[PDB]
UniProtKB/Swiss-Prot annotation, chain A:
Subcellular location: Microsome; Endoplasmic reticulum; Cytoplasm
More details: Present with 78400 molecules/cell in log phase SD medium.
Signal peptide span: none
Main location: other
Subunit structure: Component of the heterotrimeric CDC48-NPL4-UFD1 ATPase complex. The CDC48-NPL4-UFD1 ATPase complex interacts with the HRD1 ubiquitin ligase complex composed of the E3 ligase HRD1, its cofactors HRD3, USA1 and DER1, substrate recruiting factor YOS9 and CDC48-binding protein UBX2. Interaction between the complexes is mediated by interaction between CDC48-NPL4-UFD1 complex member CDC48 and HRD1 complex member UBX2. Forms a complex composed of CDC48, NPL4, UFD1, UFD2 and SHP1.
Name listed for the protein in its UniProt record: Cell division control protein 48
Gene assigned in the entry: CDC48
UniProt keyword list: ATP-binding, Cell cycle, Chaperone, Cytoplasm, Endoplasmic reticulum, Hydrolase, Isopeptide bond, Microsome, Nucleotide-binding, Phosphoprotein, Protein transport, Repeat, Transport, Ubl conjugation
Cellular component, GO, one term: endoplasmic reticulum membrane
Functional description taken from the UniProt entry: ATP-dependent chaperone which probably uses the energy provided by ATP hydrolysis to generate mechanical force to unfold substrate proteins, disassemble protein complexes, and disaggregate protein aggregates. By recruiting and promoting the degradation of ubiquitinated proteins, plays a role in the ubiquitin fusion degradation (UFD) pathway. Has a role in the endoplasmic reticulum-associated degradation (ERAD) pathway which mediates the cytoplasmic elimination of misfolded proteins exported from the ER.
One BP annotation, GO: retrograde protein transport, ER to cytosol
Shown chain mapped onto the complete sequence: 31 to 209 of 835
Assigned protein family: Belongs to the AAA ATPase family.
UniProtKB/Swiss-Prot annotation, chain B:
Phosphoserine modifications at: S1, S2
Function of the protein: Involved in CDC48-dependent protein degradation through the ubiquitin/proteasome pathway. Direct or indirect positive regulator of GLC7 activity.
Entry-annotated residues carrying Phosphothreonine: T11
Protein name: UBX domain-containing protein 1
Extra remark: Present with 3200 molecules/cell in log phase SD medium.
Subunit and partners: Forms a complex composed of CDC48, NPL4, UFD1, DOA1, SHP1 and deubiquitinase OTU1. Interacts with CDC48.
Encoding gene, per UniProt annotation: SHP1
Domain of life from the UniProt record: Eukaryota
Domain UBX, residue spans: 24-101
Subcellular location: Nucleus; Cytoplasm
Species, as recorded: Saccharomyces cerevisiae (strain ATCC 204508 / S288c) (Baker's yeast)
Length: 179, 102
């Protein structure tokens, strides 16, 4: 058994772009707190997150919040293959769009409110097809990464250009991911 | 730096700074630098060094960077690596990614 495949567990760190590994897992596979790792789960899908030492994790399975868990189309108690990718580098531009039913009611500057503070100084490692979540203004909006310039996956440094547009959509696409 | 100057730039940084192989008594240590150069990353290091020695490694590893002002961090709790003298042991910077921000 190659120790490079791990099961999905509940999340301690409530952040979106993050997964938690245990320290005895770190010596078993060289990685660090800042390291950006590629998660490839079932249904031929992927995602990118930050690994972080977690004492409670126990080396055998990893903690990931429900947002990462969703993008990989996995559940609590499913296996995933983890492997690092530093080939990815800072983004040139990004293309996120709000899902309609998560913005029904409000309008205006979604960038300044949600996206700007969410990506700021975190240089998040996103992916095309990802659907992330931002809490603010007494609600939680869901955007989907529709396009990035630096291949399928890239990072959101302060210089990276975040382009949001205002047309929203139906949740039919999620099902075609689950079906 | 030219395509041929960069490998040479890494060559200084790789051989310039002490690695004594009997000092891992305090723990051998590996840094991963996240440069703002475009998403550039270099690794390495030895036992007990300093954050400023990483700053010196940046400068030795590339000639454009020395005249530029910048700071260092770890991401997700977003700690600015202040107190440039601070040892790797005291800053929790053991095996951990260090991002650079101009």
């Amino acid at each position: 058994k190659k120790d490079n495949m791990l099961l999905v567990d509940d999340a301690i760190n409530d952040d979106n772009s993050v997964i938690a590994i245990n320290s005895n897992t770190m010596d078993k596979l060289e990685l660090f707190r800042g390291d950006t790792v590629l998660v490839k789960g079932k249904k031929r899908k992927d995602t990118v997150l930050i690994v972080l030492i977690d004492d409670e994790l126990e080396d055998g399975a990893c903690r990931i919040n429900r947002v990462v868990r969703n993008n990989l189309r996995i559940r609590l108690g499913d296996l995933v293959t983890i492997h690092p990718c530093p080939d990815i580098k800072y983004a040139t531009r990004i293309s996120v769009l709000p899902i309609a039913d998560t913005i029904e009611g409000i309008t205006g500057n979604l960038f300044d409110v949600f996206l700007k503070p969410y990506f700021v100084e975190a240089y998040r490692p996103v992916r095309k097809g990802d659907h992330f979540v931002v809490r603010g203004g007494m609600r939680q909006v869901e955007f989907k990464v529709v396009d990035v310039e630096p291949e399928e996956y890239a990072v959101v440094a302060q210089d990276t250009i975040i382009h949001w547009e205002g047309e929203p959509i139906n949740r039919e696409d999620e099902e075609n991911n689950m079906n | 730096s030219s395509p041929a100057e960069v490998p040479k730039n890494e060559t200084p940084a790789a051989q310039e700074q002490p690695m004594p192989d009997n000092e891992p008594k305090q723990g051998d240590t590996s840094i991963q630098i996240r440069y703002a150069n475009g998403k550039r990353e270099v690794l390495h290091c030895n036992s007990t060094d300093t954050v400023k020695f990483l700053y010196e490694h940046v400068t030795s590893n590339a000639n454009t960077d020395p005249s530029r002002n910048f700071t260092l961090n770890y991401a997700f709790p977003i700690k600015p690596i202040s107190n440039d003298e601070t040892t790797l042991k005291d800053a929790d910077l053991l095996n951990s990614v260090v991002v650079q921000r101009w």
